[PDB]
Paper text:
The free PkAMA1 protein crystallized in space group C2 with two molecules (A and B) in the asymmetric unit and the structure was refined at 2.45 Å resolution. The polypeptide chain of molecule A was traced from Ser52 to Glu397 (thus including eight residues of the c-myc tag), with main-chain gaps Ala131-Asp132, Ser212-Lys215 and Gly328-Asn331 due to conformational mobility. Molecule B was built from Ser52 to Asp398 with main-chain gaps Ser212-Ala217 and Gly328-Ser332. The two molecules are very similar, with an r.m.s.d. of 0.34 Å in Cα positions over the 332 common residues in the PkAMA1 sequence. The D2 loop of PkAMA1, which is displaced upon binding of the RON2 component of the RON receptor complex in the homologues TgAMA1 and PfAMA1, could be completely traced in both molecules except for the short region Gly328-Ser332. Nonetheless, the high temperature factors of this region indicate a propensity to structural mobility. Interestingly, the D2 loop adopts a different conformation in PkAMA1 to that which has been observed in PfAMA1. This could be due to sequence differences between the two homologues or could arise from inherent flexibility in this region of [name].
Residue numbers in the entry: 52 to 130, 133 to 211, 216 to 327, 332 to 397
Write the structure that this text describes.
């Protein structure tokens, strides 16, 4: 009988998250004529952002408009004043909604972004993803659901181009990448902090054993190990994915022309086998002393108390640590 069973439910990311992490495109959504995939993840992704190649422009900057080339803007809404919105203004806006007033900041931000529809559209399941900036208490609505455009035709050393990749780096620490499906009760159902003095294990015959199969990768810090596991996690799109028909000029035209459907579907792949459903190398045990990152793809079912280690996941914050090792395995002993 496993004492860890309920505690470990939040580390069952196939069930907890149920979509891609590095690239989340787990749900089919109609945009105009065609069917595309959009983020479907039920867990927030802490520390994740989109990096635009050869651009100093943040992806949180609004999408290009008018004269601006694609590379002069980001992925966000260009502004009813709905994005970027602060949590103060958010709380103010929905003060009459009881249910929304019981939501935490991250859930409120996601709820706000996922609420906006075009009435004159044939009520689709498409909704905009979000990015919550915890430091600034600001909620961004993303115009683009697309997470990576790194294909070797256009996105190899050869300016009218718009190449981008998902990434975890210091500039993104306080960001939370949010799909329209992020759980309101994510705080109890999803990971956030790295578990200090802990390593994930597998409950076998009344004891917490090591993960049977792992991939050792060199990592010099907690940040580095957390980045490795994100980079190896469940992905809904293969690396270097590219479509032949992709026309940057038509796309850039659609943006300058404020064509909502073209902007919305920009760089999105068009099948069910491309969906990870949460399966992948999502967990890692970082050995802070020997500088090793042991990534694995089978869900952990217990924790081992080991002061040399940290238990991280692809969803987890790049730095935040919970050093409180759970005592749920400690037994009552008698003085007698």
């Amino acid at each position: 009988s496993n004492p860890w069973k309920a505690f470990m439910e939040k580390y069952d990311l196939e069930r907890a998250h149920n979509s891609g992490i590095r690239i989340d495109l787990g749900e089919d959504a109609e945009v105009g004529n065609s069917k595309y995939r959009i983020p479907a993840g039920k867990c927030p992704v802490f520390g994740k952002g989109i990096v635009i190649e050869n651009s100093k422009v943040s992806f949180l900057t609004p999408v290009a408009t008018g004269a601006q080339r694609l590379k002069e803007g980001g992925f966000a809404f260009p502004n009813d004043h709905i994005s970027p919105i602060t949590i103060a203004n958010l709380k103010e806006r929905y003060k009459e909604n009881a249910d929304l007033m019981k939501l935490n900041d991250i859930a409120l931000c996601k709820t706000h972004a996922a609420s906006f529809v075009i009435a004159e559209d044939q009520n689709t399941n498409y909704r905009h993803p979000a990015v919550y900036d915890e430091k600034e208490k600001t909620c961004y609505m993303l115009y683009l659901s697309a997470q990576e455009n790194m294909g070797p035709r256009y996105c190899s050393p050869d300016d009218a181009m718009f190449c981008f990749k998902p990434d975890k780096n210091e500039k993104f620490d306080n960001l939370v990448y949010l799909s329209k499906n992020v759980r309101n009760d994510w705080e109890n159902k999803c990971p956030r902090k790295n578990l200090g003095n802990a390593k994930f294990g597998l409950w076998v015959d009344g004891n917490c054993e090591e993960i049977p199969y792992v991939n050792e990768v060199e990592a010099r810090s907690l940040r580095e190990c957390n980045r490795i596991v994100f980079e190896a996690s469940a992905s809904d799109q293969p690396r270097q994915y590219e479509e032949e028909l992709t026309d940057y000029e038509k796309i850039q035209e659609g943006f300058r022309q404020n064509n909502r459907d073209m902007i919305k579907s920009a760089f999105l792949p068009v099948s069910d086998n491309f969906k990870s459903k949460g399966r992948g190398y999502n967990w890692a045990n970082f050995d802070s002393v020997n500088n090793k990152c042991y990534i694995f793809n089978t869900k952990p079912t217990c924790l081992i108390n080991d002061k040399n280690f940290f238990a991280t996941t692809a969803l987890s914050h790049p730095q935040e640590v919970d050093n409180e090792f759970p005592g749920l395995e400690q037994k009552l002993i008698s003085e007698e």
